[PDB]
Design a protein around this ligand. Structure first.
Ligand SMILES: CC(=O)Nc1cn2cc(/C=C3\SC(=O)NC3=O)ccc2n1
Length: 831
């Protein structure tokens, strides 16, 4: 159809990639995947509750934290209900449902409707106690009043979805290599499964010219019979300069046949990019390799005491502890005992000889008896280990996804970014993981909003994964509904225009620069910029017109744009603007990953009734070295506080921060609350930052709210171009009533909090190791090694008892006290 063609054009603009373009493909896998994803999409669409989908309530099944219960008076929660120019306060029980609150309202005021958060598209609806709404917990945590408006539920009609419409050994011939413009060169051909090399062959070395020919059959030791599903033929050019991969068994279970001309990826003169089955779209300047294939469908005891102790010891070790040949042999030999231990699963499946058909068969038999795994309690860390680069088997990965099905929405949000990144480790485009993400996104608008942005971030800048991610995004967009499609259209339009202004102002650069920014912004406000758009990092908020007067260029070497918008919602309780920073020059995909780990650390701390007052601000990567950042209100740089007496001259003073805090507090009650908040937030960042190895920062990259909340910024800056374990300078110590080498009640509180927080993190060692490992593999190329990944295991002091771990961290605090201002001074000189 022609309007079908118009609909596809609309999707193409939202995706930032054309899924119907068949020029960078040597098979129909992506087209097969598009068709394959129709069923799961349609099944999820057919399953959803129109009213609940439209209202997307944001809820949790987790207990109300101890620190939140203490904020509730006499089992009473106050809710202010608005109707027009007047409002009405109502007392409520924490166990009260919004339905019961609504009937409580009509009763109190007598002599079809829905509760919506004032100024936000957030609804307090469904069969859930109010204490279980995320917004209520947000308000309870931050000392804010819960303000609601009584309004009409959104019409589910707005979410309408458009009507859909061999015993021979394996061998490969290396014909030659070609590159248009330019040593000795050879080609290495590996058969890989789960990052491990099953077999390797190489060509003879030849002079490196624009065309190099071999016409050689490379015969492997592996029989065609033994090639596992998901095995890659990895082809590399050494002088490592270039690489490319080819799936040996295709998406239809057929062995690859015939002629291939593969455009290779160049190494920037391990990482997830090195695993891609995509070929380089640049046919003009890339190196190509020409190959030929020619060769089909797919083919009780009792452990003794000591051996059991040995096996149990292997299972107890961390995910990074290497398995010896003996360890693997024990795991495999006593696999029926290993199966009784869910924690053994990653080690056991690493003991599988994936290049032996009979062994893979024995593994499939083993997993048919999955009673222990199925009955076991969901362990996200354990599940995530089975979805990394180490596992290429469909069945193994699928049992990990099976376990994820039990996660509630709030938990899917906590792990969404890293589950999207895990799609990079999947051998085929259509996978259980990709289907899982599609379903959870279509089931919940909040998950779907973030899935859009996370996918779009990779489609905009990854040539390695854009094709796979674009087919997943199209599948989601074909089921989200028209209201969501309209919303995304507006967001994309705004961000594309603001990205233009960001780069334009970047080319220039003063009073001249600010004048030019304001002229470019009026021009946008004139005939391009739509009336409003949902804030990508906070979709409950809608931004309206630019407040031109408040817009400026930041005084940094990356001269980012500081933009302010009016809120588009009339029901908002304040005339406070929405502040957004637009920056070019840093890879914000790295900031996204750090900020998500910080949120995970906060959830861990919550499990142990600890609130460390972190501030993981909104951040979204929109394209190559470009994106948006949430401006935290009433915040200033530690360096700026130092600068405002004395300079500009590295002359750091101890009392300045405490002075600033006192100046910003309207009363002494508020000042004491600010000092308490500083102690907790300083503790939170010292612990978090140390564990992630990002602790040693210049003061210019640490901020504080007038309310005493410390927080680190600019994570991509350090991770892009990567002594003291963390920042605990004499100014921070003075706020805590400490100087030099003495102690105080606040500093003792700080040390106690640090230890508790550090020990709480250590209870989730394996989860933090997997998350850290995946972050480096998918987000920070050039920070791989195994040595880099091992940092977190040293920081988390694995193999130490709690008392030794406590001493270790207290010693780290002392290192900071010994160094004083020395490190900050060297950061200042390194100008
Ligand atoms: C009031 C105020 O200044 N708030 C504020 C500033 N701010 C900055 C960031 C992060 C940045 S700025 C830069 O160049 N790079 C970054 O990563 C985050 C929050 C925030 N709030």
């Amino acid at each position: 159809s022609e309007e079908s063609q118009a609909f596809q054009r609309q999707l193409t603009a939202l995706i930032g990639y054309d899924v119907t373009d068949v020029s960078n493909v040597h098979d129909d896998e992506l087209e097969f995947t598009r068709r394959g994803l129709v069923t799961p999409r349609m099944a999820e669409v057919a399953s959803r509750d129109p009213k609940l989908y439209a209202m997307h309530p944001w809820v949790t099944s987790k207990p109300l934290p101890e620190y939140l219960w203490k904020k509730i008076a006499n089992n009473c929660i106050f809710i202010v209900i608005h109707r027009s120019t007047t409002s009405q306060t109502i007392k409520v029980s924490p166990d009260d449902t919004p339905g019961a609150i609504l009937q409580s309202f009509f009763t109190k005021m007598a002599k079809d409707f829905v509760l919506r958060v004032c100024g936000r598209d957030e609804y307090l609806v469904g069969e859930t106690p109010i204490k279980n709404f995320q917004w209520v917990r947000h308000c309870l945590k931050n000392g804010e009043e819960i303000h609601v408006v009584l309004d009409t539920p959104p019409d589910p009609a707005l979410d309408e979805v458009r009507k859909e419409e061999c015993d021979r050994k394996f061998r490969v011939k290396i014909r030659g290599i070609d590159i248009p413009v330019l040593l000795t060169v050879f080609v290495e051909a590996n058969i890989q499964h789960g990052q491990q090399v099953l077999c390797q062959r190489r060509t003879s070395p030849k002079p490196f010219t624009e065309e190099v020919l071999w016409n050689v059959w490379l015969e492997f030791s592996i029989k065609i019979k033994d090639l596992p599903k998901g095995a890659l033929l990895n082809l590399q050019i050494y002088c490592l300069l270039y690489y490319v991969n080819l799936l040996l068994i295709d998406h239809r279970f057929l062995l690859r046949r015939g002629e291939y001309v593969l455009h290779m990826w160049q190494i920037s003169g391990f990482n997830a990019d090195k695993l891609t089955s995509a070929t380089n779209p640049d046919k003009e300047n890339s190196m190509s390799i020409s190959i030929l294939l020619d060769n089909h469908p797919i083919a009780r005891a009792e452990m003794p005491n000591q051996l059991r102790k040995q096996l149990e010891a292997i299972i107890a070790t961390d995910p990074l502890n290497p398995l010896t040949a003996e360890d693997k042999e024990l795991l495999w030999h006593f696999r029926y005992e290993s199966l009784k231990h869910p924690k053994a699963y990653p080690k056991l499946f690493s003991s599988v000889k994936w290049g032996q058909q009979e062994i893979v068969a024995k593994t499939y038999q083993l997993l048919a008896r999955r009673e222990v795994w199925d009955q076991s309690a969901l362990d996200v860390g354990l599940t995530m280990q089975l979805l990394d680069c180490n596992f290429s088997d469909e069945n193994v990965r699928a049992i990990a996804v099976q376990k994820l099905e039990s996660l509630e929405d709030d938990d899917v949000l906590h792990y969404l970014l890293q589950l999207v990144q895990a799609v990079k480790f999947e051998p085929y485009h259509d996978s259980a993981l990709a289907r899982f993400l599609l379903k959870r996104g279509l089931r919940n608008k909040r998950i779907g909003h973030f899935l859009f942005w996370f996918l779009r971030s990779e489609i905009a800048q990854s040539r390695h994964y854009q094709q796979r991610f674009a087919v997943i995004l199209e599948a989601y967009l074909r089921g989200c509904g028209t209201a969501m499609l309209h919303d995304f259209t507006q967001q994309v339009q705004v961000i594309e225009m603001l990205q233009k202004v960001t780069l334009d102002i970047k080319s220039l650069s003063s009073s001249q620069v600010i004048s030019q920014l304001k002229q470019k912004l009026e021009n946008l406000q004139n005939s391009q910029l739509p009336e409003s758009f949902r804030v990508p990092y906070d979709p409950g908020l809608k931004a309206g017109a630019l407040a031109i007067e408040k817009c400026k260029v930041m005084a940094s070497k990356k001269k980012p744009l500081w933009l302010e918008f009016k809120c588009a919602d009339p029901t908002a309780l304040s005339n406070e603007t929405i502040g957004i920073i637009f920056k070019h020059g840093d890879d914000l995909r790295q900031d996204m990953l750090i900020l998500q780990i910080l949120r995970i650390m906060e959830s861990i701390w919550e499990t142990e009734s600890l609130d460390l007052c972190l501030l993981p601000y909104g951040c979204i990567s929109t394209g190559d070295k470009i994106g948006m950042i949430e401006i935290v209100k009433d915040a200033t740089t530690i360096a700026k506080i130092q600068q405002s007496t004395v300079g500009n001259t590295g002359a750091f003073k101890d009392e300045v921060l405490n002075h600033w805090l006192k100046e910003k507090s309207p009363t002494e009650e508020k000042f004491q609350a600010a000092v308490e908040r500083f102690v907790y937030s300083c503790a939170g960042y010292c612990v978090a930052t140390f564990v992630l190895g990002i602790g040693d920062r210049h003061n210019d990259n640490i901020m504080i709210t007038e309310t005493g909340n410390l927080f680190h910024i600019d994570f991509g800056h350090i991770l892009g171009n990567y002594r003291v374990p963390f920042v605990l300078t004499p100014d921070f110590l003075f706020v805590m009533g400490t100087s030099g080498k003495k102690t105080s009640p606040h500093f003792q509180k700080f040390q106690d909090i640090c230890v508790k927080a550090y020990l709480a993190l250590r209870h989730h060692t394996n989860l933090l190791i997997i998350l850290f490992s995946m972050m480096l593999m998918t987000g920070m190329p050039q920070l791989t090694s195994k040595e880099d990944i091992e940092y977190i295991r040293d920081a988390l002091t694995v193999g130490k008892n709690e008392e030794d771990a406590k001493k270790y961290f207290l010693d780290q605090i002392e290192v900071c006290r010994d160094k004083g201002w020395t490190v900050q001074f060297n950061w200042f000189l390194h100008l």
